[PDB]
Design an enzyme around this catalytic site. Structure first.
Site, PDB file in Angstrom:
ATOM      1  N   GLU A 247      37.431  44.598  41.522  1.00 33.30           N
ATOM      2  CA  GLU A 247      36.452  43.534  41.776  1.00 33.30           C
ATOM      3  C   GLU A 247      35.284  44.135  42.550  1.00 33.30           C
ATOM      4  OE1 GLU A 247      38.865  40.710  43.891  1.00 33.30           O
ATOM      5  OE2 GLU A 247      39.440  39.619  42.061  1.00 33.30           O
TER       6      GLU A 247
ATOM      7  N   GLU B   9      44.086  38.719  36.401  1.00 32.45           N
ATOM      8  CA  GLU B   9      44.829  38.124  37.506  1.00 32.45           C
ATOM      9  C   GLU B   9      44.655  36.616  37.445  1.00 32.45           C
ATOM     10  OE1 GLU B   9      43.602  41.646  40.788  1.00 32.45           O
ATOM     11  OE2 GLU B   9      43.644  39.520  41.340  1.00 32.45           O
TER      12      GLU B   9
END
Lengths: 685, 687
Positions: free
Chosen positions: A494, A612
């Site tokens: 991320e 995720e």
């Protein structure tokens, strides 16, 4: 890492099985039945029409009990040349047995094949009596088993291995719900019920291994729901067991692409550790059977297919198409020495199935540099990873694991990765490869808002870290280069800008830095060549976010090879629902619907995955064993919706941690069995 | 001789002589070759001589039939008769040897006297490569027996004084490097059909077997598939490479290729195998395409060591041979002289061969400790270690092909201008390091010019009148002392000459250009006058201050030479000046600056090649990049170097990095000081 049902399988059988596992879900092996029994005459016809042989030729021991073999003029199993010729040419051998029996106790089978039957309408042979020592059923059963074993021993003598599909279609129509008397087995080995059937299977398995047969891969033919679950139960009660079966087969005639998809996926869901094959197919009087490539594209990704001869044989037009389809392996294309087989990114994503994140493990960090490997791995409360953890996931219906790894504490001043750490990453990759899973290795808390994060979507940060990042990925790529296409690389997790802005970067130049990192990751991996020239690589959006600005400013890296990139985003939406919502309502469901809608609109030819998802919201609060029952149901509803929507959009999802956590991993057992249950029912239906 | 170290560490004198000859012509001319008619003759070379009046330089023979029984009495092949090879070598031709390693079709097959019963891959034989290594197999027995047979022939050749290129186990990878893995992409010879690890074992076994038997007359050539002409679908075959200790030459086999394709193949292999020479081991026509004219391929950049067409249907036409055998760039048999110590090379050819260049700065150009000190006192006076052979070998091994050796002389000159012998010997020793390593080397006159305290060569009418004879006496000594080194050694008359006020951009008065041009003419006249190799050696003349401005270029007059095409112009570029201090990235302004510079140089100089003799990050205060610089500043340096190298290549120029990439204590390891900068340069040049 290869363990067949026969624990004493020779090296050639293990080699063949390893090859099947290599192509499974990648390509489909072609096959053709013998004309009746002991030849490859139908394969020869295919070769004349198309110039290509089927990969597999199947033979039938149906007439093993006929006397005067070698002088009766029409069948002689003592001559193994019809099989030996096929194998010596590189073809794969398959064997089956229409177990004919005498019609009664006084009937003697003639040289013409007279006096044989196959069910109670034709013989008085009782499956029950075949198992009790000293019965006319038993002595015929045991010495035809002897005769076939002797033929298989001679095949093994000549280096032949084979798929073996005895006792097929056991249940017949016996699984009919109503119990009307046409709901019956049509073969004698299924007419006394499932428990006797399983014991027939066990007796043949035990008898074969004690004779020294170790060249067979065992394939059991399921009836599934006979095409109508409204009318039939499944035949799970007839399953001989994981220790006695390697492949689950299905026999379908006149079926369409979409019907094949339904059969395949239902079987795959109930037998997760087994490969699924289309053991018999062909036309009937009503309809033809679907084109192999079309059925494959619908999701019927069988290990192999094999049409029947005679009136069931597909037309010449059908074979002309099938033998020229890229997804179809013909005999010339078999390479059992391959250790790697390129797979398109969309194909891989469709085979991920249910996925799981091994989180807070190799991504754990913060104890400093120079510590023992196990100190990092357990720093955030997880136990050390083991092979049984990966085995558990595969045995329980998951086909992909994402392995987050944080690297900065394992890199010296010059950017070299500590060898003990890279060796530990490899061992866990090996755990997953040995289990038959897909695995993703990434670069994790080197990005985002942690203290040690150093990869950031920022012009100046990119300039100071470009070479370190490429040097990291060169090391990773070279260290994992030898693993086959089941291992994928994810460039970064991320990535945020220098202010850790979560929704989008403060400056548009942040997208430029992100795209450069992504291009550099692809370049560094492809530069190492070998398997890494075509390995599937995963590229994440800014912050793994999915807003319109992030998606519009996302640029896919340029790749010299085609269809080997996947996009990854993360989804804990609607944000903080676990703290603020009581049930997974229509607002929750519609939020997910728009996410997948937006993604499928943006990425038409490039697959994307939900890398995720979970209940994690503000302050790292999430579901657990101790959560109130309604909160566990809230987690179950989210995961069921996520998995279903992803399947319908040809994506894949990876649950973040909660379902398989902490001490549960050591057991091994699900932390949240109800959530996993909802996911499996969502996917497998 | 002494500086030659082949893959075979025990190579005999004649093999080292041939290897030195190959290095002499490499990049200068291309050796013609021709394949035997099938096996053991020079019948195809003879037909070339009938058609053109000239023989190809090399004839290649094939051991393809070595296992045929009854040699001497089968009436068609006899390898015990080495006359077909000795005839050729005695006439001055170069010998090449290869081996289509035929094997029996199966374990029960006996090869017949007529050649029956042989095969070369799995479609023709059951012979497995992996079994050939395993003692006790039928393959291994055949393998070792044919290897002994071939080694016995080569030993007889060695006794007759023959040396040869040896190209065994060729085209090993076949199509097995296909990215996808489909088994239509496989090896087409048995020795590659078990993969690259077995293949390298086969190579090593043969190499060590031959060496143990006393075979030391071979120069080993390994045939690469490169990317099989399409890197989008093939990996390269680097995993198949037997290694630097087992290979001398890299060969490539190309049929029906154009000039631009051959250039792409040559340059790709050269970049991956920098210390080896690259050769066109096989060529010819196919159905659809002729093979390219040798000179047109050569001038596109495919400067192979040699070429060799195949026979039969692959044989190029008579018109093709008539053109090729009359091209000046092609060496034919009558032109071979393995006793030559020098081969004239045009200035443009040399500049094209310079590749990536490096300045061995702050070394022999260091000065200021006074006269009469030990040689090592000068060489280490500015912090650099004493130069060694390993430093120059490291450059060649890592993709550089030219080194500039700055020398400052004034402290080693007596009152009458005689250069101290110990100093001149040390300059010679370092030149020899570079020559042995196979590099181009530039020797100049450095801090005798420019702004330093000992500088005495100045762009000024009076200074020139007072120093012209000392300057000519200096270059007579340098040229006489270095006269015997071959064409890889270049002279550069002066470094950065300024007027009497050290004016950096332009001389204050136009007579400064006149003085500069006069020094430049005196330098050429002094060198040419020493004769010998120096009559045609390539020489380098610098502009005022080595600058590139409009007035400096306008007032630069190239000296008049006695020979054609042996002058190179040199300038320096640290542009945009002080960028390393003032800039954060190598941006459009930086890039635009360099593209206008190269545009200006290419407009002024056309047939005359020019080089960037110095470039780097050095700005004010002489602040520059080092390994301790921030990573973003190292990126800045990498981006400058990558731009400089690519631009110069596209403009048919060349570049020499000033110091920073290979500096100080890193020289004695040896290792790069700035690996990411060098990698940027290699990727820019080799792409």
């Amino acid at each position: 890492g290869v363990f067949l049902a026969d624990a004493s399988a020779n090296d050639a059988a293990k080699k063949l099985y390893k090859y099947l596992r290599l192509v499974y879900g990648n390509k489909i092996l072609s096959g053709m039945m013998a004309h009746v029994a002991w030849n490859h005459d139908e394969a020869d016809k295919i070769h004349v029409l198309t110039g290509k042989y089927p990969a597999i030729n199947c033979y039938d021991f149906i007439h093993i009990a006929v006397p005067n073999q070698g002088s009766n003029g029409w069948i002689n199993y003592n001559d193994i040349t019809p099989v030996t010729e096929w194998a010596d040419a590189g073809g794969i051998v398959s064997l089956m047995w229409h177990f004919n029996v005498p019609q009664n106790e006084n009937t003697t089978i003639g040289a013409d094949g007279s006096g044989q039957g196959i069910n109670s309408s034709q013989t008085t042979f009782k499956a029950s009596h075949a198992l009790v020592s000293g019965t006319w059923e038993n002595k015929f059963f045991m010495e035809q088993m002897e005769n076939v074993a002797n033929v298989i021993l001679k095949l093994q003598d000549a280096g032949i291995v084979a798929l073996w599909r005895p006792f097929h279609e056991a249940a017949g129509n016996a699984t009919l719900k109503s119990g009307a008397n046409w709901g019956k087995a049509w073969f004698w080995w299924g007419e006394d019920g499932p428990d006797v059937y399983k014991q027939l299977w066990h007796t043949m398995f035990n008898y074969f291994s004690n004779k020294g047969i170790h060249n067979l891969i065992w394939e059991w033919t399921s009836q599934n729901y006979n095409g109508d679950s409204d009318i039939y139960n499944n035949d799970d009660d007839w399953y001989p067991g994981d220790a006695y079966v390697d492949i689950i087969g299905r026999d379908l005639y006149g079926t369409t692409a979409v019907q094949q998809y339904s059969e395949y996926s239902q079987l795959k869901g109930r037998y997760p550790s087994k490969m699924i094959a289309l053991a018999e197919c062909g036309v009937n009087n009503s309809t033809i059977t679907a084109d192999v490539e079309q059925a494959w594209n619908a999701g019927a990704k069988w290990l192999n297919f094999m049409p029947w001869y005679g009136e069931s044989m597909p037309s010449d037009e059908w074979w002309t198409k099938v033998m020229n389809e890229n997804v179809v392996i013909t005999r010339d294309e078999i390479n059992q020495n391959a250790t790697y087989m390129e797979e398109s990114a969309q194909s891989a994503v469709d085979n991920f199935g249910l996925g799981f994140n091994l989180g807070n493990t190799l991504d754990a960090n913060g104890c400093g540099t120079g510590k023992p490997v196990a100190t990092y791995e357990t720093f955030w409360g997880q136990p050390e990873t083991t092979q049984d953890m990966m085995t558990f996931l595969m045995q329980n219906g998951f086909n992909a694991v994402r392995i987050p790894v944080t690297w900065y504490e394992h890199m010296d001043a010059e950017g070299n990765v500590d060898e003990a750490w890279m060796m530990r990453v490899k061992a866990i990759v090996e755990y997953a490869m040995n289990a038959g899973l897909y695995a993703i290795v990434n670069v994790h808390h080197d990005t985002a808002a942690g203290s040690g994060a150093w990869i950031k979507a920022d012009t100046d940060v990119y300039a100071a870290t470009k070479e370190k990042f490429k040097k990291l990925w060169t090391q990773i790529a070279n260290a994992l280069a030898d693993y086959d296409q089941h291992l994928l690389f994810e460039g970064y997790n991320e990535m945020l800008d220098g202010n850790n802005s979560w929704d989008e970067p403060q400056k548009a130049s942040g997208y430029e830095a992100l795209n450069n990192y992504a291009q550099d990751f692809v370049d560094a991996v492809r530069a190492t060549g070998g398997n890494n020239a075509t390995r599937n690589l995963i590229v994440n959006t800014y912050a793994a976010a999915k807003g319109e600005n992030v998606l519009n400013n996302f640029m896919l890296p340029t790749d010299a090879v085609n269809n080997h990139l996947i996009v990854q985003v993360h989804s804990y939406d609607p944000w903080n629902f676990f703290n603020t919502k009581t049930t997974w309502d229509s607002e929750c469901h519609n939020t997910l619907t728009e996410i997948f809608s937006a993604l499928s609109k943006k990425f038409t030819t490039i697959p994307y995955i939900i890398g995720e998802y979970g209940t994690h919201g503000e302050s790292d609060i999430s579901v657990s064993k101790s959560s109130p029952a309604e909160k566990i149901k809230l987690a179950a509803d989210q995961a069921a919706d996520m998995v279903k929507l992803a399947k319908d959009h040809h994506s894949a999802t990876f649950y973040w941690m909660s379902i398989f956590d902490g001490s549960d991993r050591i057991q091994p057992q699900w932390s949240l069995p109800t959530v996993v249950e909802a996911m499996q029912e969502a996917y497998n239906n």
